[PDB]
């Protein structure tokens, strides 16, 4: 599926439970894996609007080339049946991270 070889750290604490579940099932049903912890093996980190990242986390993300994205990256990729350009879904783009 479109998320093959993708490992998503999910930081989506403030999403409704139904949406958290749907993000997870969208990821798993389309070849991806997810974790709630950020580690070097993560390829992506999904951040809802109300979640933020520490400087420590941002440093880890830079070092390990993790893509920061919003939930829309998942929703839209699923809708379009195609892995989209993750650079257009980066909440920390304003910081150039």
Curated annotation (Swiss-Prot):
It is found in: Cytoplasm; Nucleus; Cytoplasm, Cytoskeleton, Spindle. A motif (Nuclear localization signal) lies at residues 16-22. Widely expressed; the highest levels are in the kidney; also detected in heart, placenta, lung, liver, skeletal muscle, spleen, leukocytes and pancreas. Residues 1-91 form the BRCT domain. It comes from the Eukaryota. Mono-ADP-ribosyltransferase that mediates mono-ADP-ribosylation of target proteins. Belongs to the ARTD/PARP family. Component of the vault ribonucleoprotein particle, at least composed of MVP, PARP4 and one or more vault RNAs (vRNAs). Interacts with TEP1. This is Protein mono-ADP-ribosyltransferase PARP4. The lineage of its organism: Eukaryota, Metazoa, Chordata, Craniata, Vertebrata. The gene is PARP4. The chain holds residues 4 to 100 of 1724 of the full protein.
């Amino acid at each position: 599926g479109i998320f093959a070889n993708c490992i998503f750290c999910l930081k989506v604490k403030y999403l409704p439970q139904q949406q958290k579940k749907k993000l997870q099932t969208d990821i798993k049903e389309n070849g991806g894996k997810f974790s709630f912890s950020l580690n070097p093996q993560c390829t992506h980190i999904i951040l809802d609007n109300a979640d933020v990242l520490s400087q420590y986390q941002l440093n880890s993300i830079q070092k390990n080339h993790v893509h920061i994205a919003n939930p829309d990256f998942i929703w839209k990729s699923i809708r379009e049946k195609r892995l989209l350009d993750v650079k257009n879904y980066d909440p920390y783009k304003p910081l150039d991270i």
